[PDB]
Structure 1
């Protein structure tokens, strides 16, 4: 069902959005610190199958959050992702030849989610 997938994608994007907005603000002194970690994302993420690269970077995401309940949020996130692309490696994420900060990483995926939701029309 198109609506199931849309819902899941919305829930997923809102959790990511919660983290991004939650750490990327002037009331967080750890930011600079968090921006030194190199995150990996797809160069051109567009198919739901690409959610494999987000999945492969979740423990790293949970790790940066420790500098900011993460353990529960990431768990929720991870399940939704599996629900959106299964348990098989759906893509060979040797990733972009380029890296990213959590701000970019999250910007990519939040945009990915918002886009696919509209595309599902």
Structure 2
């Protein structure tokens, strides 16, 4: 299917954007890296299907906030938003968050692993 190729490329682009954000974070100087690891993110309890991307969508505003403190973030997050919303679509899904919060590093990596998990199935 042609639409399956659309889902694939969109997942590849989202994976790349998250990898790019993380790459810049890994190169931060010691005092800067320390301060951004205090910014807490909500994590998914389950992330095996495309509908679970609602957990990412809801956490894009904190992500835009964290990137603003460490610096364009407004434009980059808006681009990711479009892809995230398009990738999940049916009506409205309630997202279940884990008890323990994580840092930007664990947050990004989880969603990077999520994207890699779906790409391989199609």
Q: Give structure 1 stretches of 5+ with no counterpart.
A: none
CA RMSD of aligned residues (A): 1.6
Q: Structure 1, residues 5-61: CA drift from partner, whole Å, max 9, x if none?
A: 010001011111111111122446421111112101112211000100000000100
In the aligned structure 1, how far is the partner of 2:47 from the partner of 2:34?
26
Deviation at 1:94, TM superposition (A): 3.4
- The 8 Å contact of residues 50 and 87 in structure 2, kept in 1 or not, is answered as yes
In the aligned structure 1, how far is the partner of 2:112 from the partner of 2:52?
13
- The 8 Å contact of residues 50 and 90 in structure 1, kept in 2 or not, is answered as no
In the aligned structure 2, how far is the partner of 1:90 from the partner of 1:28?
41
Deviation at 1:115, TM superposition (A): 1.3
Normalized against structure 2, the TM-score is what?
0.89
In the aligned structure 2, how far is the partner of 1:72 from the partner of 1:10?
19
- The 8 Å contact of residues 19 and 112 in structure 2, kept in 1 or not, is answered as yes
Q: How many residues align?
A: 119
In the aligned structure 2, how far is the partner of 1:25 from the partner of 1:96?
28
Q: Structure 1, residues 49-90: CA drift from partner, whole Å, max 9, x if none?
A: 01000000001001110122111110000000111112x664
- The 8 Å contact of residues 42 and 93 in structure 1, kept in 2 or not, is answered as yes
In the aligned structure 2, how far is the partner of 1:27 from the partner of 1:15?
21
- The 8 Å contact of residues 43 and 98 in structure 2, kept in 1 or not, is answered as yes
Greater percentage in helix:
2
Q: Give structure 2 stretches of 5+ with no counterpart.
A: none
